[PDB]
Amino acid sequence: PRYLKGWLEDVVQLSLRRPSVRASRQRPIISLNERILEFNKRNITAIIATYMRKSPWGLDVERDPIEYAKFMERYAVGLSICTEEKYANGSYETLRKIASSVSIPILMADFIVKESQIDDAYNLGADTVPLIVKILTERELESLLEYARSYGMEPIIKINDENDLDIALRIGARFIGICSRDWETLEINKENQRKLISMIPSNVVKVASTGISERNEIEELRKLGVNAFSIISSLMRNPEKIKELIEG
User: Fold this and answer.
1) How many structural domains compose the chain?
2) What is the rounded distance in angstroms from the CA atom of residue 53 to the CA atom of residue 62?
3) Could you give the C-alpha distances from 114 to 6, 135, 168, in angstroms and in order?
4) Enclosing domain of residue 154
5) DSSP H helical ranges for the chain
6) What phi and psi values does residue 192 have, to the nearest 5 degrees?
7) Where would you tag: which of 7, 165, 181, 189 has the fewest CB atoms within 10 A of its CB?
8) Residues 127, 31: contact at Cβ < 8 Å?
9) C-alpha 56: how far from its chain's center?
10) Cα separation of 147 and 64, whole Å?
11) Residue 49 sits in a domain of what CATH number?
């Protein structure tokens, strides 16, 4: 991985040591980026709902992952499930159980740093993984993009700045996540996020990560060409906020 300090240093070292699983995939791959494009055509607001016990940008919530998942299956364009252990208290088993219970696309939200983690995602029933430009060398990044693709997965490439973006385009990303949050300094910059978005080809499927609380925020970003929205904390706390976000 890249030259890292902070908690990112430690979580990348943790991820390197993640034991791989032996499990058989049940479901077929349900493409997340494709369902986004389907939601755009149908003119339904495409919201990616996240399940995450713990974060550094909010408070821990303990809730039933199955009741959450089944509720979101009615509204969300896809489901992100944090599987990172130390800082999110997430789990491979929770992923497997949610995947087995719902028929919407599933993102395995983790720090993907090695091939076997993509093996894990696949074997547990996830449809895609994120790849984080900040964290991986351009070489690692290209390699894991191809490796995921060999399974029929299209990873979402997560960018934060002009350099991340350029590199994402350079490796040929078709599915980009634009984060407003700097992860080391934790600071949200929406002006930066909008600039990044304006600089991405119209045919890349673009996901804006949540400085997103309002419908008219969604709408402004829809106008700017954003395809889907990732909204983590507020849906973990108040799952019903999602319907008010898809509808008036």
Assistant:
1) 1
2) 6
3) 20, 12, 18
4) 1-248
5) 6-16, 32-41, 65-72, 92-99, 115-124, 138-149, 162-170, 190-198, 215-223, 233-237, 241-246
6) -55, -45
7) 7
8) yes
9) 16
10) 33
11) 3.20.20.70
